[model samples]
Target: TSPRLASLFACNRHEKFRECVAYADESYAESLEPVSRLAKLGSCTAVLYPQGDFDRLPATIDGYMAFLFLDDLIDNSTDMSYISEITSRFMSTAKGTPTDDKRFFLLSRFFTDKRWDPQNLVLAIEEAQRFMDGALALRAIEIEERIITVEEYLDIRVPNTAMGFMFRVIGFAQPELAEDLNRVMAEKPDLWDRVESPSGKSVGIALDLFKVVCSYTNVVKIWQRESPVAIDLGEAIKFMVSEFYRYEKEMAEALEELAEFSPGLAQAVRDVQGGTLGWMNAER
Candidate 1:
């Protein structure tokens, strides 16, 4: 509740980032586009950690906005055949490679349709490099998750592009990061396999947040209630609350260690964690 608002790029950054939501539904033809919640999704994440160009670093906030729409399309109705190509294009557009999918080319093109300076360009490219591949992998997870267990949530977890999304954002914002991570993504393309990044350490506490909250928020999209995915929703909730408390334990004592090194980076990461904590809380 006490996160800083003074650093935000616009007086109305929420509206600026979010105005595209309705337009996305109009284009994608969504019947269940949660207009109000989608708008909050617009609330500029840069507001949580505003130190970069106009709330625009760690990838185009607009692309992030566009991704929500794109994500909705994939979850609801985007054809599966498109997933492989879309994932490829996410790499192409972000990496300046030649893309196969026109829509992917266009969306990646749309992200570049704005003014991205050098660091902005660096951040966007680096972060988006693996996004499509991760997204395509996630597409497969959603397809095949006929049964999702806590073990599945914890182990054979569904790959989330946004999880990758936040990871790179933290990486780009933190100065000590990235070299041929792009090449690793392109040359290997395994969606997710542990490839430790310096960025990962900085946001260790923040990323820990998901182990509890919102971990199950998208589970329904992947698992069916009638199919009885054998997951105890209550059991997951209890575990998450326990996990949240666990992360809070680590952060409470040691966050200052990170702050001592790079206050701007540390604060931003914590702010991101806290912001989404509220976000998850709101939906509950």
Candidate 2:
């Protein structure tokens, strides 16, 4: 089961990479460092976002944010200590930006127009689980094969693979969504035209939403490429828990900084804090 399952799962990463390239205009050149490594990391990050909710972010900014996060994780060698710091930096930066009502409007419009369906949500969850499993399984195999130490496998291989998968997934998912987005853009050219005008606010919102879409699209991609091996399942869940803890702590600090920039958003964060507390306790 292990060997057969591993072989079956192995190709998922490649499939996902191809999908990402197809969706993102092949913008990711081979020049990108540790091509396999980065794609895996990106894929994990991509799985974080829920489905039908990709268009709420700004792509260039958020995409870079995602990129920077993975870069730091890789550069720092995926040290657990750095995860919180990276997460905090991201949330703080986002909060520092001035609020754009138009961008908010655009985000709201996109969500309302594209109602969430339980089926897609289920699909998204299943995919995320698969990606998570594959990554962990690969990690175990690397350890068994003496490719890397357990510590290195945990900190480096697991996280990088997850992130690489995430980046590629996001890159690919964007174009598929874009097809629908372009249709909307054409049908409601006036709305988009007004949205795309020279105003900083309009552009800001547009950019932000693009990032959000990319982020969520990446998430879906990761999910789609997930593996089903039991060993992979265990390791993936462990990785997620560790990563989430790092992210949550950093997010809290970020909220503090955001409070200084946008009090309303900060308040919104506070409001939702308690609601999601149980997330940490949930089983894999």
Candidate 3:
């Protein structure tokens, strides 16, 4: 963790730290893998939104945990219909129907929580479905043992990684930005569809670069495991790194457009994008 991240969170002293962590642990009790992930999610919440309300934090953590749990479930399972069925169950559970399963139960409660805007939650879940579709496509390629071009990987990975969904939930977490967030979200319901939109694109590339940097080696190894593909790891990494710099600069330049519409929303996204960039650089 960076000094800023650590300073932002004293970890033990936060009044709601234990409450939120216990909430996540219970929600994810069905699986042991999310133990570490839950901690990271909690930390990210604390670090990302230091001023966030304690009452609202549980739903935020639970929502992100639900998404990561589903993402991990999809990644580990080999059954196609099973994935869809589980996703359906989770969606149904979120939409007023309840399930005995802890995972769905978690989502059910998160969706029903009245702290934040319901429309924003809907938008986040909808993007999650798209992310699931993207994950399926990426899974298909992995199952076939085919290595896609870096450009192709970005095509599927950029939006599919649930960056938009995560950002929307993050917006809800910051209570102060609710007015601006709702205003923008209402005006441009399909903001994420427009790849050129400043806020969406900025959030998109930050996640794209983060994923590539973190998983590039594992992805390359998987691509080469059983297939005799002459994939150039060095070349691909170079390309994405350059692309990260390019898109990051563009994100800086385009913030004014979003600022003109909503200064608070613009600053919120700018802080997130900048923090992400800072984390990557600081870790190195």
For each candidate in turn, the TM-score is: 0.54, 0.23, 0.71
- Candidate 2 lDDT over 58-133, as tens digits, reads 2322343334433444234333345444433333332333323322222122222333333332333333343334
Kindly state the number of residue pairs that clash in model 3. 0
lDDT of 3 by residue, 89-137 (tens): 7667656786666666567677777776766767767776766777777
* Candidate 2, poorest ten consecutive residues by summed lDDT: 1-10
Whole-model lDDT for model 2 versus the true structure? Answer: 0.31
* C-alpha local distance difference test of each model: 0.42, 0.31, 0.56
Model 1 segments beyond 4 Å from truth? 1-37, 50-59, 77-80, 97-126, 145-164, 170-231, 251-255
Model 1, position 155, has a per-residue lDDT of 33
Quantify how close model 3 is to the true structure by its C-alpha RMSD in Å: 6.1
When summed lDDT is taken over every stretch of 10 residues in candidate 1, the lowest stretch is 1-10
For model 1, residues 1-284, the per-residue Cα lDDT tens digits are: 11111211122223233433344334333322333444344444544334434334323443555566556665554457876654554665666565444344334643554443345457555555544544555456556644454334333232343543553454443334222333333443332233222122212222333333222324432232423446564543344444445535454344455445445544554555455454444444
Give the higher-TM-score candidate: 1 or 2: 1
Each model's Cα RMSD: 9.0, 19.7, 6.1
